[PDB]
Amino acid sequence: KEQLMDDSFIGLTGGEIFHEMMLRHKVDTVFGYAGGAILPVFDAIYNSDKFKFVLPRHEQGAGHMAEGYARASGKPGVVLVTSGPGATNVITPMADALMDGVPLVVFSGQVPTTAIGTDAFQEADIVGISRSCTKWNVMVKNVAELPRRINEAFEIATTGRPGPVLVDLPKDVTASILRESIPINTTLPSVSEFTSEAIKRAANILNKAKKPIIYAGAGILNNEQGPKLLKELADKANIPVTTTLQGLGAFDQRDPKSLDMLGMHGSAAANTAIQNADCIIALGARFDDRVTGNISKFAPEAKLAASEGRGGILHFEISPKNINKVVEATEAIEGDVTANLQSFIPLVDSIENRPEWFNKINEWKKKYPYSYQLETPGSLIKPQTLIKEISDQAQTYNKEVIVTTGVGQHQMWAAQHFTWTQPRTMITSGGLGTMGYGLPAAIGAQVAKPDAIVIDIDGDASFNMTLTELSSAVQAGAPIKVCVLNNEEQGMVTQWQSLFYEHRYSHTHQSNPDFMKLAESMNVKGIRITNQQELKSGVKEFLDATEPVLLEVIVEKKVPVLPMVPAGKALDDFILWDAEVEKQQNDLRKERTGGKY
Amino acid sequence: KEQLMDDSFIGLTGGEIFHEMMLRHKVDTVFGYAGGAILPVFDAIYNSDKFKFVLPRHEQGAGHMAEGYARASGKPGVVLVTSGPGATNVITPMADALMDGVPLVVFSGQVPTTAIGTDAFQEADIVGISRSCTKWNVMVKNVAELPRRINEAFEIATTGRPGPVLVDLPKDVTASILRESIPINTTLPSVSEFTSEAIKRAANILNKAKKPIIYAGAGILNNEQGPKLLKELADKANIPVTTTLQGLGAFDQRDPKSLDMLGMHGSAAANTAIQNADCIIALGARFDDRVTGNISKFAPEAKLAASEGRGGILHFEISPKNINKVVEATEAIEGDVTANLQSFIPLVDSIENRPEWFNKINEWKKKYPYSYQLETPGSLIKPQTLIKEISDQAQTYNKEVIVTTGVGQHQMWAAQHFTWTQPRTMITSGGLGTMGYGLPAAIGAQVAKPDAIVIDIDGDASFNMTLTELSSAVQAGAPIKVCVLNNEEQGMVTQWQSLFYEHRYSHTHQSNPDFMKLAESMNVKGIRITNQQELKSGVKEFLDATEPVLLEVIVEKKVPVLPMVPAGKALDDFILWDAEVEKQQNDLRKERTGGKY
Amino acid sequence: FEIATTGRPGPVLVDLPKDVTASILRESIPINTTLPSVSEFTSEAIKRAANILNKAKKPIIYAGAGILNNEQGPKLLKELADKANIPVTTTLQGLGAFDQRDPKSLDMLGMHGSAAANTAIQNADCIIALGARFDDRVTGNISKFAPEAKLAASEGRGGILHFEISPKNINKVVEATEAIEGDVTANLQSFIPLVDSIENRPEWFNKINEWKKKYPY
Ligand SMILES: Cc1cc2nc3c(=O)[nH]c(=O)nc-3n(C[C@H](O)[C@H](O)[C@H](O)COP(=O)(O)OP(=O)(O)OC[C@H]3O[C@@H](n4cnc5c(N)ncnc54)[C@H](O)[C@@H]3O)c2cc1C
Ligand SMILES: Cc1cc2nc3c(=O)[nH]c(=O)nc-3n(C[C@H](O)[C@H](O)[C@H](O)COP(=O)(O)OP(=O)(O)OC[C@H]3O[C@@H](n4cnc5c(N)ncnc54)[C@H](O)[C@@H]3O)c2cc1C
Ligand SMILES: Cc1cc2nc3c(=O)[nH]c(=O)nc-3n(C[C@H](O)[C@H](O)[C@H](O)COP(=O)(O)OP(=O)(O)OC[C@H]3O[C@@H](n4cnc5c(N)ncnc54)[C@H](O)[C@@H]3O)c2cc1C
Ligand SMILES: C/C(=C(/S)CCOP(=O)(O)OP(=O)(O)O)N(C=O)Cc1cnc(C)nc1N
Ligand SMILES: C/C(=C(/S)CCOP(=O)(O)OP(=O)(O)O)N(C=O)Cc1cnc(C)nc1N
């Protein structure tokens, strides 16, 4: 009885209890910003030596920083903000975290319980507003339930498909003192036969397959053994591997079995292979609409195989909501993909060779490289070339390399032209696609991994969204490396306007600040590369820097990302790069715009 | 029949119909930012000469710009953004607009109807998320109902208490073409006996009053004749006038009847007067908790008068929700306050003199000025003095002067020390209290009033939130004037930490960029005032500038805003400025922080 | 009234505060409010659906409540079944849409439906779904539903042709080979003239008649 109750927190404020529970959940970093409603918590964590506190310039920054932290570390990112505008400012990061499966634990101050529902000073209905962009939220109503609500939040955030949760903290609750004992369980943090039979059935299906392919995504990264078991499966059964944008780094792209990224802007080889495979092994990926192309025309050969009892789609997925949501799984294997792979692989027949299949695959890889128009004398640097340069030079340091991005063409080129080899090194906003993500994510990732090289490959329009957080990087002691691909345009949107709206560029050219004077004002090192001859040495100075650094690179404008699967088209119905076509496109654009673009 | 149907829109896309309806609603300005889902609308408004388009750097900027535009102009502010993160980025401005009664019409792109509910690319449930921070929202489901939904949005935004609405626009709807005729009514924009009796009763109550006071707020500004009728009432019945923060400018503060601002940081004279009045005439104000002080102790004399049938509270309010929400109205007069004043005033007895009442009031004004510690030799500029300087010099131009603010101490000092004389010249975030509001609001206000002087009185922490929008001011041709009060602290929060948390400054000092190099990078004129001797000439250069200009002023740190009604205290239980107390506070702060602050 | 009766019909509620219904109208109102009330994409889908049916060797009509939401519904259902010589099964809610005395009638399908109807749908190469939503009382185990029609779809010689008015119910339970959006009766008027008349299906109807004989209630 007395063994089941705890009185060790009696006499503490809600704020102090918060502090203690952070410690018990092994929180080493908090991202946040103060305000009137959250002052009792800020008073309790005053000069704490138990975790690092990171102060942004804007709560959106705190949110994206916590996301970057979470994706780099595999731990939940913790956010601490005030009521009202402090809390509504974290909504985009929460929606972002939900779409990309990021464990985010948001604590928001709230007006006193006696003031809730009165349209009080700095009162927002954050529980109502954040409901659709969290896995779960709650408003703590008294200090006695505060430890329990904190436990539940961390548990929900990190289990199933990871995602954001919000915990609302009324000021009178965090200021109040615990006077009663509480269940000791609340003061501490934390294979079905049906699934076993599904695994056996899945193995038998794969053991019949003649053209298998692994389609791997973010879920394989949610276990340290994930990439290891993926490689073990691919080696044993001799299977080519393609990944999503969010799966980049799960498989060593230097391996001959690597088909690179699939999808709208993925490799035409990967896209061809998945459209011709008789068995698709989907490992922690959700068949997003950037990946599948036209859904009714997706994976024709695997559907045929399924109907003929010799193949199909084997879906390893932890969230039942995402099983049979987009495409029918021939076998659904529910639970953690890594754990289920341990049971799967020993049932899978070892295969030495697949001559006809790998002959096709090798032929496809050869005819479908990421081709583009190279520099010519006097031309600007091509964005594709810049990415290759950064990738090549970065690999030569004896440090881990982590990449974050903004959203747009630069993001796709980063995905295509880097060589991905390590897990949790691509940190990018994929589901929601939030411009401005790049810089604060890099800061969060850098705090999680102080010895890593962290590179933010950013667009000029994206960078403009959140560039005030440069000051935050300095104050946090985070030596991030920001590379702005300055094409002086919202390139991804102008690409669509070029292609579908006859070169009518409607409000897609924002004016840029002087990025070198900007960096100087922020106390950050600045480097500007303006021509081909400065590329190599400029990138080296960038990577050699031991302080926060902003590199601006002037790059070619009005260049499309290719290959491209246009909306409505089958995954293997792609547009490929062609030199003559690009030249004609340039002439057309010039004529139509009176030579303006 | 054919007279009631319209076919003039047949053949147009949803995007083109949007364009036409903007014209019909007399929209002259749109604030927005492009994206994939909203491209059919952006294509339709391409090179439109029918309205000015303003491009921010961040959709939060668009939102606050539209708010500034709306408050300066009295027209709805129109926002046009894309799906997903474009739309979630407008949530803080929407919550802001709701709390402050600002007519905001937000149009957000959405993924095609065929993709909704699939966790699609850049899909957010913005209708669900924005529900609690809009008056009303809707998702348009086909092009035939688009004109009707646009009409409803503008109508709801601008009637009753004005507020934000959101209209969600699926891409396939805006791309689709109208093939059918629609009701011609949808293609065009738009005194009860009970209230009449209430007015008569209210007049009889006022005609008995011996200590009346007018408590006027934002609602009086929602009609051009508002301030005129307020003055007519105050003159005829000889009544002193106090206003809220949001009512500043409704009454000429140079008039002897002016009691200035009431509330937490309002004049102790105004606060004393309302606590002693036997009749309170509340004109378009909602008894917010920043104004009332301790509610149970609010307006004792008016409650007594009500019980004795010789006075009370007469509440002129347009929204039934806000009648009898906080305090009981003796008489509730529902509807537009200006219209109801036209019926009220002729029933009100003219009064020539109130010797005993105005003797008290004049005595109170004399003993309760906005006192503070003046500069001393070698000291930094006092923030209160800076505000007075700007106010005095700005009044000497032959132009309208509009002021926006950030949120914090600078905001309160701006409210106190400017002399307010004209309606719609205070544009400040009061209900939600959003830091970062100042700069984009100024841009919106400047676009609404191209011939006005627009001054953003901003805090350094507030300015950091949204400083990227400096580029937007330049690209928009908006010659705003930004004054950053640089105390190198989140002053309002450090004031509370000084007073209630024993000078424990927990994470309330963010590092600032070099504001002069920042302005230079943004192509904005920069002025820095660092000492008392530069104050006058620096402010003159600031106001004489004919281009966007950023003025940084180094001001005294750790100075409290006074007077102050602390939480829980009655409105007339205020802290006043005292020179000796300030000195002791300084010594205490110095000792406790080891001389750090 | 408009929302209740259009799309898939359904319930609506209108809440009427007492002071509103007691109050008197003092102002004029838009005269429109005082009175009650084929896409190329769908046309192409219909043509494609017809071509699919014209290849079919074991077709079956699966008809439900939606066919009853137009007076001409049952008429056009019968016209289609006669012209292309197709056996007809219905849901519980579709009962009465087709004359069960007709030799083409397979009776009700589903959990407690005719084993003949259930056998027939599991063996059909083309399923014409007319105003029915593939409810879980009807489909049985979903992954094992309509094996022959899925095979036919993959081999480009059949599949599921779904005539449905509510987009929410298209591709909700089973993937439609062709989705024909809108009122099923109206879309049948466009569909039937593109459909090849068939006089006999000896092997198919031999199976069907055998199934009806061995599976009475
Ligand atoms: C401009 C732009 C273009 C894009 N184009 C492409 C493109 O061409 N190709 C591409 O791939 N992406 C592209 N995307 C990104 C795309 O939108 C998606 O974000 C991405 O494809 C999702 O990848 P994912 O399924 O691996 O990750 P997620 O979206 O996170 O899905 C992971 C799945 O695995 C499950 N899971 C999680 N944990 C586990 C576990 N422990 N065990 C089992 N299952 C688990 C999850 O529940 C979920 O169903 C683009 C994005 C942008 C902004
Ligand atoms: C740091 C800080 C300190 C603050 N301290 C103070 C302070 O000391 N003093 C102070 O006053 N404020 C203060 N505030 C601001 C305060 O929070 C409120 O925002 C403000 O008092 C509201 O003023 P209001 O009632 O006039 O405007 P609103 O909040 O807009 O309320 C207007 C009312 O009038 C009604 N109305 C609207 N239109 C009409 C119409 N046509 N006819 C009739 N009625 C209509 C509305 O429905 C509403 O009920 C502070 C804000 C901050 C950020
Ligand atoms: C104890 C019990 C046992 C049951 N067992 C069975 C069983 O064995 N067999 C069986 O069939 N049912 C059974 N049911 C009933 C079953 O649950 C469903 O209610 C029924 O099958 C639904 O039939 P339906 O699809 O035709 O009608 P609905 O549920 O109404 O679906 C009609 C579909 O047609 C669409 N539609 C509507 N109007 C139009 C239009 N104008 N044009 C095009 N489309 C339109 C609708 O949007 C909808 O998708 C049972 C019920 C109970 C209580
Ligand atoms: C406008 C836009 C995009 S991606 C513009 C991208 O601009 P930039 O950073 O210069 O990248 P790029 O030139 O290398 O392509 N959007 C599409 O994704 C819409 C969008 C709009 N707003 C936000 C916050 N996020 C978004 N993704
Ligand atoms: C932190 C804070 C405030 S007001 C800090 C204000 O900083 P600053 O701009 O330098 O003004 P000041 O020094 O003249 O007072 N908050 C209280 O209102 C909390 C807050 C936090 N975040 C947002 C977006 N808005 C807020 N109001």
Ligand SMILES: CCOC(=O)c1ccccc1S(=O)(=O)NC(=O)Nc1nc(Cl)cc(OC)n1
């Ligand atoms: C800003 C948070 O405000 C509140 O929490 C709040 C809201 C409504 C009623 C009472 C309070 S309170 O009395 O419990 N707390 C405050 O009012 N705090 C407060 N903090 C700061 Cl830094 C400033 C301020 O008024 C400007 N008020």
Ligand SMILES: CCOC(=O)c1ccccc1S(=O)(=O)NC(=O)Nc1nc(Cl)cc(OC)n1
């Ligand atoms: C970004 C908006 O995306 C959508 O609207 C969207 C979402 C899900 C499915 C189909 C579409 S769509 O086919 O109707 N439109 C697009 O996919 N548009 C699109 N626009 C840009 Cl500028 C980029 C892009 O992919 C990167 N996609």
Ligand SMILES: [K+]
């Ligand atoms: K690569």
Ligand SMILES: [K+]
């Ligand atoms: K004043």
Ligand SMILES: [Mg+2]
């Ligand atoms: Mg760009």
Ligand SMILES: [Mg+2]
């Ligand atoms: Mg400050």
